[model samples]
Target: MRPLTEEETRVMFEKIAKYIGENLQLLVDRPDGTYCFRLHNDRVYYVSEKIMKLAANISGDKLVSLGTCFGKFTKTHKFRLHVTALDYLAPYAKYKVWIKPGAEQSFLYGNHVLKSGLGRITENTSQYQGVVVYSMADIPLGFGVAAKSTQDCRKVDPMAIVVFHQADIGEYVRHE
Candidate 1:
């Protein structure tokens, strides 16, 4: 939730910016029948440092992108914007909360909320709101709890906390 250690913060910001640039691609079709992702195919595979380190510590060695309040649901694999409530998780790691996903109308808040990692409250904006952030991503999203933390965990419907796209994460220092 809070920014990572100085070292991690530096690395994460760099990676995040690189991700945005790399994730963007020019899908142009050549004379041939096939299409090509000009930029994304090379040097774009990236993940936040926090997620990478977290997964590395675990046995599975996989990246995790969880909605702050919601538990992870690996089914939704594709996420246009990936975020984890680093600020909230670092402090309130114990208490479990739920995160349900909603669209633009359903998701509204100053970008500050997401940057701070306090986790925002989303109103009943979506026709069907699921308490799972990863599940919300019909695009194949995923998340997981540390195995040690899984036991005795209250099965709260994972909360999908969201904020406006313009949220300002100064620490993420790449937007400018």
Candidate 2:
């Protein structure tokens, strides 16, 4: 994989920052080991320095996937992140919502999280803001936009939606 270009780097971080927010620094700037973002055919991948050194030899062959494929840059220089990203991508975001056990499967099924499914939510979330979705067990299920602010959620009906599913874990599994 070729290291991302300056422009690609900008867009990659910009896109990723949406979900993980400021935590991007923790992943990009590791204390002990160095990390790198690269492009294997326009799609972005995240890997460490030594792991890529191992790829120096396999560069002759087609080799295989490097670190987790995070996002892809378009010809226009825009980017899109993936659900595969959640596994190795940055965590510990600011705005978070916990879905009850009963709601976890519904979310994985690519459905929006209803207030009935909301176990808890972080404070001061604005309407239409991005937030990370987690299970009551604290597993990263996917990502979502706040369909309703914390205030609205308190007043909304049980059947009403709270989180708008932007991308979910299983929904992305069906994609390339």
Candidate 3:
């Protein structure tokens, strides 16, 4: 996995921040000094590099289908959702990633917390295991995702993936 340089990191963060401001219902400002999501009274939500890439894909109109047996540069992305309070990828810290949100869709697609497939979506959750590849001929993708939850935008579970969640997307109740 490639460790992003300072400049690269800054550019990536900027892109993510801009996307969050434009595409989602989230606001960039919060008690955490702004440009951060507040999760609760004591916690704040943030995105990991890995989670950013994975969740980024969820912003698309519809999930793409790659079936299986595909490989691309580290760019192709796949989204997945989990219910636990911890980030699962910490152990496999070698992979380069960037996550933001879109977990509910990922979960439903992944079948981890959901019971049935959206049908219009893909087939199995494992199908999203690696980088997204349009096909054997198309360029391989890096990653993408978007977490769905009701936690305060300023606070979050210390172990949260920041990309996947247990709650349904629309079910989230915003705090005033």
Candidate 4:
């Protein structure tokens, strides 16, 4: 992952702050005024010390090892959301998809969420938006990209994939 520049960091943080409706700088700022973030090819990942502290504070727990590095030039820096972060932000996620119990296993295995498996979807959710997938019981399954718009998914073919899985706690637990 490559380090983010000053301009990019400011714009990115501002967007996130607006999206979450909270001052992320309060969680991302340092005492000396510096902020940190990284660009992992397509997406920017924030691994700033302040962010870890914020996650720990919001979740009321500590964070452990979250990733690995192969070298200074070649490394993995995908932002893996800590369970605590997921727990803390579950309610505030902009787009949400709730899947039925019968499809839980398939989703955890990285398969797309089919329309038949969808129990609920937040109204006005757009196509290609980032969404948090949850079980009907409210347990977070993971993050995913929406394949169809909210209105379309509600009336589309039952066999169509509605959400594409991105990351999940299950992947971490299984690998560990």
Predicted structure with the largest lDDT when compared to the true one: 2
Against the unseen true structure, what C-alpha lDDT does each candidate score?
0.26, 0.79, 0.26, 0.63
TM-score of each prediction: 0.17, 0.84, 0.18, 0.61
Worst 10 residues of 1 by lDDT: 36-45
TM-score of structure candidate 3: 0.18
Residue 89's lDDT in candidate 4: 45
Q: What is the lDDT of candidate 1?
A: 0.26
Q: How should the candidates be ordered by lDDT, best one leading? A: 2, 4, 3, 1
Can you tell me which runs of candidate 2 are displaced by over 4 Å?
A: 60-64, 74-77, 172-176
Ranking by TM-score: 2, 4, 3, 1
Mind giving the per-residue lDDT tens digits that candidate 2 earns over 27-108? 8678768888777777777778777788757771243365777767777768877777876552657888999976788888
In candidate 4, stretches whose alpha carbon ends up further than 4 angstroms from where it belongs are: 1-4, 7-85
Mind giving the per-residue lDDT tens digits that candidate 4 earns over 1-176? Answer: 45566655555544343224454544445474544454554444445555444653443222223322111212342233333345434566767889997567788877888999999998988897777889999888877778889999988888989988766657656856
Q: Each prediction's Cα RMSD?
A: 17.5, 2.9, 19.7, 7.6
Per-residue lDDT, model 4, residue 176, is 65
Question: Against the hidden true structure, what lDDT does model 2 obtain?
Answer: 0.79
Candidate 1 error regions (>4 Å) = 1-19, 23-26, 29-105, 108-162, 166-176
